[PDB]
Amino acid sequence: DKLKKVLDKLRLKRKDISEAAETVNKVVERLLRRMQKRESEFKGVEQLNTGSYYEHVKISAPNEFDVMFKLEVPRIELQEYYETGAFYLVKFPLSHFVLSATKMLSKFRKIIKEEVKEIKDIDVSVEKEKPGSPAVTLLIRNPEEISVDIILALESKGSWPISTKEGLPIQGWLGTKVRTNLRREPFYLVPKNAKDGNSFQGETWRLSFSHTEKYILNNHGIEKTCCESSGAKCCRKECLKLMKYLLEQLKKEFQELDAFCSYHVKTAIFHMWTQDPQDSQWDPRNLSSCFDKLLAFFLECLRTEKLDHYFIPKFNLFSQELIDRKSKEFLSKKIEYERNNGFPIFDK
Amino acid sequence: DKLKKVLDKLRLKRKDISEAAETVNKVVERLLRRMQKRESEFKGVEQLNTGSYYEHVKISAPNEFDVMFKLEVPRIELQEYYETGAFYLVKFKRINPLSHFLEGEVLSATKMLSKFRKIIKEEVKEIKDIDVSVEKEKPGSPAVTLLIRNPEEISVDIILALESKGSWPISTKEGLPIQGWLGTKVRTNLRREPFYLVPKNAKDGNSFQGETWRLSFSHTEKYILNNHGIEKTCCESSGAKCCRKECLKLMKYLLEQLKKEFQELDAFCSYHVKTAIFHMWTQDPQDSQWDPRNLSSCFDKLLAFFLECLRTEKLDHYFIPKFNLFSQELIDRKSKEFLSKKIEYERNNGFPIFDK
DNA sequence: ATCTGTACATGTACAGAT
DNA sequence: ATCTGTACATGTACAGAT
DNA sequence: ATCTGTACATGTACAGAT
DNA sequence: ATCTGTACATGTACAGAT
Numbered sequence: 078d079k080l081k082k083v084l085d086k087l088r089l090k091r092k093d094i095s096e097a098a099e100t101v102n103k104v105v106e107r108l109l110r111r112m113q114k115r116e117s118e119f120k121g122v123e124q125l126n127t128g129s130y131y132e133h134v135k136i137s138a139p140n141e142f143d144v145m146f147k148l149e150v151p152r153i154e155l156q157e158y159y160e161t162g163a164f165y166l167v168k169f170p171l172s173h174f175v176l177s178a179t180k181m182l183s184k185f186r187k188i189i190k191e192e193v194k195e196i197k198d199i200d201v202s203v204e205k206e207k208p209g210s211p212a213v214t215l216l217i218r219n220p221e222e223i224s225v226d227i228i229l230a231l232e233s234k235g236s237w238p239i240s241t242k243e244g245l246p247i248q249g250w251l252g253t254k255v256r257t258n259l260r261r262e263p264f265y266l267v268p269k270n271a272k273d274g275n276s277f278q279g280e281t282w283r284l285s286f287s288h289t290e291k292y293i294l295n296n297h298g299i300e301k302t303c304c305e306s307s308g309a310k311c312c313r314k315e316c317l318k319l320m321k322y323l324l325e326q327l328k329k330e331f332q333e334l335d336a337f338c339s340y341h342v343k344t345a346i347f348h349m350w351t352q353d354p355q356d357s358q359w360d361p362r363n364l365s366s367c368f369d370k371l372l373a374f375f376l377e378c379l380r381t382e383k384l385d386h387y388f389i390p391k392f393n394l395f396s397q398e399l400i401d402r403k404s405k406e407f408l409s410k411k412i413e414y415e416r417n418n419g420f421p422i423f424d425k
Numbered sequence: 426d427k428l429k430k431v432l433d434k435l436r437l438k439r440k441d442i443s444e445a446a447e448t449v450n451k452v453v454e455r456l457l458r459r460m461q462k463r464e465s466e467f468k469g470v471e472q473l474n475t476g477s478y479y480e481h482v483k484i485s486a487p488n489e490f491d492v493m494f495k496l497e498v499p500r501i502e503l504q505e506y507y508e509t510g511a512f513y514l515v516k517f518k519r520i521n522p523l524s525h526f527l528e529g530e531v532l533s534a535t536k537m538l539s540k541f542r543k544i545i546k547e548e549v550k551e552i553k554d555i556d557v558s559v560e561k562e563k564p565g566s567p568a569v570t571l572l573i574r575n576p577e578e579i580s581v582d583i584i585l586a587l588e589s590k591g592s593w594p595i596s597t598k599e600g601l602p603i604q605g606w607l608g609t610k611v612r613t614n615l616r617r618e619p620f621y622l623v624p625k626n627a628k629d630g631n632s633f634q635g636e637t638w639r640l641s642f643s644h645t646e647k648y649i650l651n652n653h654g655i656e657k658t659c660c661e662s663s664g665a666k667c668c669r670k671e672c673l674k675l676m677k678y679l680l681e682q683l684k685k686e687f688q689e690l691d692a693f694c695s696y697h698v699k700t701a702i703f704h705m706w707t708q709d710p711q712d713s714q715w716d717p718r719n720l721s722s723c724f725d726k727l728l729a730f731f732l733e734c735l736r737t738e739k740l741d742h743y744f745i746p747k748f749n750l751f752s753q754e755l756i757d758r759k760s761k762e763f764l765s766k767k768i769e770y771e772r773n774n775g776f777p778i779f780d781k
Numbered sequence: 782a783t784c785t786g787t788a789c790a791t792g793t794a795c796a797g798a799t
Numbered sequence: 800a801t802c803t804g805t806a807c808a809t810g811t812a813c814a815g816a817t
Numbered sequence: 818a819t820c821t822g823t824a825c826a827t828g829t830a831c832a833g834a835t
Numbered sequence: 836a837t838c839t840g841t842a843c844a845t846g847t848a849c850a851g852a853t
């Protein structure tokens with residue numbers, strides 16, 4: 078009962094979706110035209126919608142959209158960045174950009190910013206640049222506030238880099254045919270825009286499988302009929318929404334949680350889904366015991382500082398080098414507290 | 426156990442398969458290239474391997490291969506022939522490599538098939554490697570059949586197909602009812618792939634005889650056979666085995682064995698058993714209703730179903746539900762009760778015909 | 782110089798053979 | 800159990816054509 | 818090459834049936 | 836409370852026309 082009521086509060090309304098998307102769409106098509114039908118260095122970018130709104134796991138409001146402008150770049154060679162798994166140098170139209178992420182992102186940002194100054198019918202400005210975002214973020218003021226991430230991404234049709242060979246362990250869940258087919262799809266590089274003052278940081282790209290994650294969200298069952306009109310609904314996404322909400326509520330209260338994000342929850346539940354592949358283990362009637370085991374799994378990830386990237390298994394999202402242990406135990410205690418006390422944080 | 430041992434006799438041999446496939450591929454590759462050359466009306470034709478060998482349900486010996494030479498034919502058409510569901514006249518809107526086969530807008534299937542056959546025949550004379558001749562045309566068949574004596578005997582049906590990328594003809598709207606078994610996402614995708622038209626090629630002396638085409642879904646059937654489960658891992662290296670293909674195999678063998686002894690069964694063929702089992706797989710969707718341990722009862726329920734189809738004279742085409750392959754107009758009830766008894770005998774007597 | 786239809790290159794599920 | 804040969808999807812190099 | 822058109826899956830919303 | 840059925844909405848893939 079309780080979790081249900083939370084999910085109805087989390088539900089987006091058809092009317093807010095209609096108005097939010099029609100304005101987002103207007104802006105994104107225009108920015109896409111400016112890239113192509115003007116003789117630019119990104120002539121030929123294609124649009125690919127990603128993220129939780131397009132996975133149907135967006136909660137609360139339709140106020141955050143994610144769009145990837147992807148560009149095919151042929152026979153480009155990669156080189157792994159100090160055995161990290163996820164970050165790569167790109168070596169060999171793109172002349173005026175080793176292919177530089179910061180240089181290529183900067184012009185991309187310029188073009189979008191020029192085009193946004195010429196918007197006159199929608200209240201839209203470009204958010205200030207951020208450290209660690211490959212994105213140009215647009216703040217749109219409908220009556221309401223909507224943010225849009227325009228992600229720049231290179232697209233390579235070659236086979237996936239060696240670090241992902243162990244990745245994507247869907248063989249017991251979605252299957253070897255699905256895996257092999259997914260691995261025939263392209264793979265994508267986005268800017269690692271870190272400002273860490275470290276090393277190759279300006280020339281570093283990050284792998285991106287947002288297109289694979291989108292498929293999996295939309296094809297998440299062991300039975301092909303999971304959540305279709307002639308099958309049984311499951312509660313896999315409803316658990317992801319509840320765990321995203323718990324993290325969102327926590328992050329609002331405790332800035333000591335600034336270094337956590339929804340992709341940690343996303344990653345953790347890809348692992349749970351592979352641990353519990355049967356659709357019956359995610360029966361709607363077990364929603365409470367399913368949330369519960371997901372919190373437990375997330376608490377074992379915090380406690381052991383181990384959250385491997387579902388596609389790059391040697392890339393630990395919970396390594397000391399990314400998040401301090403105090404932050405993890407901070408989060409453990411809040412999680413433990415909410416869990417044993419029937420989630421008071423949900424009731425506000 | 427009894428049924429396991431049959432399956433072991435039915436299994437093909439990798440040694441036979443290598444020798445068959447090498448020869449067959451050499452020929453098919455050479456006829457496809459010849460299609461490509463010159464001002465051939467069939468330049469652009471494209472190969473597509475179909476049938477039980479490429480579905481991994483070919484039994485006994487690898488002695489029969491089916492290959493589509495398929496040709497994309499843009500520009501719309503299609504006039505359903507007398508509400509039969511399955512048969513169509515092809516019309517053209519522009520006035521073209523297929524200029525020669527037209528009869529004012531209408532594409533002559535037999536004229537197309539005649540030229541196809543002459544070209545295949547001309548290119549067969551010039552093969553000097555392997556013993557391969559072109560079998561005499563059989564009525565009601567879109568195929569050009571190669572008999573190969575790679576020492577042993579091997580058939581290869583070259584089927585001429587037109588390929589249309591449009592949405593499927595409306596007589597399939599209610600067909601392919603996989604929603605509860607393979608699901609709607611699958612159905613929509615499958616219905617987005619092209620559909621194919623092959624020459625009917627009957628010499629019945631009915632109107633439009635030489636201009637009638639028949640629908641073909643062999644590409645959809647191949648997907649279905651290699652993707653037959655509710656669970657995505659059915660029969661994969663990290664999932665549970667089933668016995669769906671094993672039942673079809675046992676069904677096909679009973680029919681083949683019977684069809685050898687008794688010529689009363691000429692009007693029956695493996696598409697009949699194949700069709701009946703697509704219905705069975707839709708009736709029993711779950712992988713657990715096809716557990717390998719239950720092979721006997723699965724084969725049993727499939728037989729009883731087939732017998733009811735025979736006896737009530739109803740075997741609806743899986744893709745064109747208004748097309749009844751067992752309608753009186755296709756097979757005499759005499760033939761249908763002859764098969765009912767022969768099946769009933771085998772079933773009540775521990776399948777003697779398997780021991781042959 | 783450039784382009785491209787054809788054929789090779791690469792990867793893996795399936796299923797038989799050990 | 801592991802090993803292996805065929806089929807098939809997709810990427811890519813190239814001799815020959817523009 | 819760009820763009821529209823078509824079909825349908827995934828949603829929300831709600832009324833009536835269990 | 837849950838389930839089924841219809842209406843209303845957006846996203847998406849691709850054929851065919853420009």
Ligand SMILES: Nc1ncnc2c1ncn2[C@@H]1O[C@H](COP(=O)(O)OP(=O)(O)OP(=O)(O)O)C[C@H]1O
Nearest residue numbers: 127128129130134135136141143286287290339340
């Ligand atoms: N740290 C990261 N490493 C790799 N990929 C990431 C990372 N953060 C985000 N992504 C990718 O970018 C996608 C969009 O990011 P983001 O908007 O933050 O998340 P989301 O999944 O849309 O969740 P919300 O529901 O909006 O919180 C999701 C994922 O494919």
Ligand SMILES: Nc1ncnc2c1ncn2[C@@H]1O[C@H](COP(=O)(O)OP(=O)(O)OP(=O)(O)O)C[C@H]1O
Nearest residue numbers: 475476477478482483484489491642643646695696
């Ligand atoms: N009467 C028919 N109506 C529609 N499609 C047919 C018909 N007969 C055959 N086909 C199609 O052509 C394919 C090849 O037929 P055929 O060679 O007789 O059987 P098969 O499936 O190859 O099995 P076997 O070779 O007999 O083991 C199977 C099916 O997709």
Ligand SMILES: [Mg+2]
Nearest residue numbers: 128129130141
């Ligand atoms: Mg989002």
Ligand SMILES: [Mg+2]
Nearest residue numbers: 476477478489
């Ligand atoms: Mg065959």
Ligand SMILES: [Zn+2]
Nearest residue numbers: 303304310311
């Ligand atoms: Zn589901």
Ligand SMILES: [Zn+2]
Nearest residue numbers: 654659660667
């Ligand atoms: Zn199976």
